[PDB]
Design a protein around this nucleic acid. Structure first.
Length: 264
DNA sequence: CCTTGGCGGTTAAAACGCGGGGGACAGCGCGTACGTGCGTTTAAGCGGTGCTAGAGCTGTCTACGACCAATTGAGCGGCCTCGGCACCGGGATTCTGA
């Protein structure tokens, strides 16, 4: 049903059976990246405190860096300098250990995902990957794109000044829907000094059940949208009722201390 | 000189049982204090240029302490001396508990 092939095919827009109208994407890309960060001055290395054995697996064998590691509890994946080396299990964004996903049609609200097999809680599913914008381009491209009459906006605010677009290029995590009864959620992990957004499960999801995540509600123009799930209390509407501004939607830029002019 | 050791008697003391009240403990609903997040503002550090107070390094020389002889009286001790205080008793007053 997914069938990732590099040849472009005859499916217009819905991307349900032919995924090669747009392009896919690996770990995200940047535009104006400069060397002003906490990367390699104080977060050079954050090594866990573990005294392993690593010579007894498959018999009296505890998995390395489980839920007692200092980094997993604080949402940090280990580096290559781990005392376990190539047996540590924290590095899940680097070894690309994913979950079995599939994209078919469930409801007329749109496309989504349904679980293939059983999946336990606190299990990683997919990484949100896209194109990283910057301060000036967001408020221009959004008003340039609102006049194109599109339904889906693939914008996610990483920080108060960073918004990731998953429209031109997107992985399999772009189809996941919204519901007022969430069973998956989003977490902010720190890998190699850079912040990444991942998807974790919360319960024991049966084989053949929905996998959606809760939106932190937001609206951007004058119109409103509504959800079609209706689990038991569903808030009716994507984005709620309350209106917020262009800057509040994106997070309003950390103003370069120039001038006042930019606020006006 | 006084420490370790010994036998012996007195009775203050520690250990043992019991009743049952004191409080240590798990559990719950609730209110808001402190957090994650985030725009705007203050002023913390840089570096550059400049002045100079005050630390630092040469020279004097006499005020000050160490040392020495002779003198002798102040402080440590031995020995009686005697009264401030504990000990014991009869009694009135405080305080706790049901």
């Amino acid at each position: 049903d997914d069938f990732r092939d590099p040849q472009r095919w005859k499916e217009c827009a819905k991307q349900g059976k032919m995924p090669c109208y747009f392009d896919l994407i690996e770990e995200n890309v940047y535009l104006t990246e400069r060397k002003k960060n906490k990367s390699h001055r104080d977060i050079k290395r954050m090594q866990c405190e573990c005294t392993p054995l690593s010579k007894d697996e498959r018999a009296q064998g505890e998995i390395a860096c489980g839920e007692d590691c200092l980094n997993r509890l604080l949402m940090i994946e280990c580096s290559s300098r781990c005392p376990n080396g190539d047996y540590c299990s924290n590095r899940r964004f680097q070894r690309k250990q994913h979950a079995d996903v599939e994209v078919i049609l469930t409801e007329k609200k749109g496309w989504g995902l349904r679980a293939a097999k059983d999946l336990p809680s606190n299990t990683f599913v997919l990484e949100y990957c896209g194109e990283v914008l910057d301060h000036k381009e967001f408020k221009a491209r959004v008003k340039e794109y609102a006049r194109n009459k599109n339904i889906h906006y693939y914008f996610m605010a990483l920080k108060n000044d960073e918004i990731i677009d998953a429209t031109q290029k997107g992985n399999c995590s772009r189809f996941m829907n919204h519901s007022c009864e969430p069973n998956c959620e989003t977490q902010k992990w720190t890998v190699n000094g850079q912040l990444r957004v991942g998807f974790f499960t919360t319960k024991l999801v049966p084989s053949g059940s929905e996998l959606t995540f809760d939106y932190q509600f937001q609206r951007y123009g004058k119109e409103a949208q509504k959800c079609f799930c209706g689990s038991a209390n569903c808030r009716g509407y994507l984005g709620g009722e309350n209106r917020v501004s262009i800057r509040a939607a994106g997070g309003k830029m950390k103003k370069e201390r120039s001038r006042k002019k930019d606020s006006v």
